[PDB]
Paper text:
[name]/[name] proteins are a broadly conserved family of integral membrane proteins with close to 90,000 protein sequences known. Structurally, [name]/[name] proteins are defined by a conserved core consisting of a transmembrane domain (TMD) and a cytosolic cystathionine-β-synthase (CBS)-pair domain. Here, we determine the crystal structure of an archaeal [name] ortholog in two distinct conformations (apo and Mg2+-ATP-bound).
Further insight into the conformation in the absence of bound ATP came from the crystal structure of a [name]ΔC [name] mutant, homologous to a Jalili syndrome mutant (R407L) that is unable to bind ATP in human CNNM4. Crystals of [name]ΔC [name] mutant purified in UDM were obtained by vapor diffusion in presence of 0.1 M sodium citrate pH 5.5, 50 mM Li2SO4, and 11% PEG4000, but they diffracted poorly to 6 Å. Subsequent additives screening improved the resolution to 3.8 Å with the addition of 10 mM MgSO4. In the apo structure, the TMD remains in the same inward-facing conformation, but the cytosolic domains undergo major structural rearrangements. The CBS-pair domain has completely dissociated from the disc-like dimeric configuration to a more elongated, open conformation with different domain-domain contacts. To our knowledge, this dimeric configuration is not observed in any available CBS-pair domain structures. In agreement with the AUC results, the loss of ATP binding disrupted the dimerization of the CBS-pair domain, which then makes contact with the helix-turn-helix motif from TMD. In addition, the dimeric AHB dissociates and binds to the CBS2 motif of the neighboring molecule, competing for the Mg2+-ATP binding site. The two conformations are interchangeable by a 90° rotation of both protomers. Despite the large dimeric rearrangement, the individual protomer in the two states is similar with differences limited to the AHB and α8 helix.
Author numbering:
A (entry chain B): 1 to 45, 50 to 148, 169 to 324
B (entry chain A): 2 to 151, 164 to 324
Write the structure that this text describes.
């Protein structure tokens, strides 16, 4: 080695470390700032961005470690370059200059400019941040009664006794879970992802339903939902190669602990109306229709 | 000497790592404390708090003051870890100083101190309120520089439902309950709050004998309390407690002694959340503030259920 050689190796490592911090700091801003619905439309038109968005906090962990390690090195290198140039006072010089640059070009700067060009930057840093996350994945693994309250309201003038019954259901609506209102697996209708469109139409008429699940060689592995309008329109327009895998649309899975009040709001946002349910092990449990949720309100 | 300067850097290293914990832990706790909770602290005779409000008015300043601090502090941790490191392990010490500083700053300077903020967001805020406020005053030039540098369609529900009615996934009979339940969740407190102007309150300095006059004149059972201005709500006063007092007061307790801290909420609190949150607290009224921390109205459980029942 040599003094000049090492210093030039350090300055390029110092220059590269600063540029790496900007990529990590600006990536969080662009990653999180993206609107959820806009991400789905782009995905339909990315796939890694949707993967990282599944765990919003995961993006924060990966980026945090990236920016922190990058900025530590900027100081580490500049203060080695600092002392080999100005002596013990070089740690002060290195601390001053490395501190100024990490803010200007390493954290403050890139965060602001990420909102201006948030579109292109978000997609460009989707894949690499997803690669770093897989590298930083092991560390991430380490991170990992009622009548009393109401009767009082009426006495305080808060509630009117006429509006008591309706209140009761609104409370039982939030407390109710998907496991209670759903339909059990044993009684659910199903069609495999490898079946002729003619057979689905039979199922659609024998049972009469419009959305029948699509399992994948196993009752536990649901891979899509099949609308009857998609099948009836497929056999009519003779498509020599028209399998269920094409017509099925990816479902929206939920846990058994999901409250039905949230489910109903979300389903009408995503233009869907049936939801698939999974258990703690990731198997298949049932299906909740908007009708199933409101059945308790219909029977009072 | 070599040994005495290595002793100066090892303590400054420990200190620099503590600052990054101060800036990092304070950043999490301060932003997460809801502005409705900050309003409660000021009227509570709480330590600091009055400073905690000054910072909450600017959401950028809190992010700049914590970023600038934790950055300079983390650069200092590394600058000192390589200074100590390079003297201990030659030119390989620049590498050890990068590893030790980067693994400690994350664990004990950024990630770890964030954990204490989540569990203790309130007390940490009042303990770090004033400090971050004089850091902002001296970081003023950069802050000015950074400031200079800086769909619920009615038809969608109808079509979406009728599409469901066609699928059989929804029923036509159950349309009303569905159209209403959607409006219930998407309704804010503002839309159901009795406006500030029409609210009847009692100043905390008033007499219990005067409170009774208000309870009878209006007929309400619970009337808010405003410490100095109508913009301010410091508590709610139940008539049942005022009557029991005047009957056997003896000590003549004032409003501040008999009132109770309200449930402050923002104008945006979806009533769907407000109902479950209020009935869990066994409380049925909720004061409603605004972004600037003023007073804007109140919400009772009937208000949230009125439009739904009458519809």
């Amino acid at each position: 080695m040599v003094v000049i050689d090492l210093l030039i190796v350090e300055v390029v490592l110092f220059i590269a470390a600063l540029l790496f911090s900007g990529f990590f700091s600006s990536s969080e801003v662009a990653l999180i700032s993206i609107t959820r619905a806009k991400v789905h439309a782009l995905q339909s038109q990315a796939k890694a961005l949707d993967t990282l968005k599944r765990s919003t906090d995961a993006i924060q962990i990966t980026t945090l470690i990236g920016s922190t390690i990058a900025n530590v090195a900027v100081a580490s290198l500049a203060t080695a370059i600092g002392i080999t140039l100005y002596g013990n006072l070089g740690i002060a010089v290195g601390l001053v200059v490395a501190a100024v640059l990490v803010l200007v070009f390493g954290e403050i700067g890139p965060k602001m400019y990420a909102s201006r060009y948030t579109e292109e930057l978000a997609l460009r840093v989707s894949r690499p941040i997803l690669f770093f996350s897989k590298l930083l994945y092991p560390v991430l693994w380490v991170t990992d009664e009622i009548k009393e309250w109401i009767d009082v309201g009426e006495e305080e003038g808060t509630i009117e006794e006429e509006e008591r019954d309706m209140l009761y259901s609104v409370l039982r609506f939030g407390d109710t879970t998907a496991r209670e209102v759903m339909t059990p697996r044993v009684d659910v209708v199903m069609i495999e992802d490898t079946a002729t469109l003619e057979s689905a139409l039979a199922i659609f008429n024998e049972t009469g339903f419009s959305l029948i699940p699509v399992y994948h060689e196993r009752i536990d592995n649901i891979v899509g939902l099949l609308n009857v309008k998609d099948v009836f329109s497929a056999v009519f327009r003779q498509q020599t190669s028209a399998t269920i895998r094409d017509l099925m649309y990816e479902p929206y899975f939920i846990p058994e602990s999901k409250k039905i009040d949230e489910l109903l709001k979300e389903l009408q946002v995503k233009k869907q109306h049936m939801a698939v349910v999974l258990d703690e092990y990731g198997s298949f449990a049932g299906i909740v229709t908007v009708e199933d949720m409101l059945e308790e309100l219909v029977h009072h």
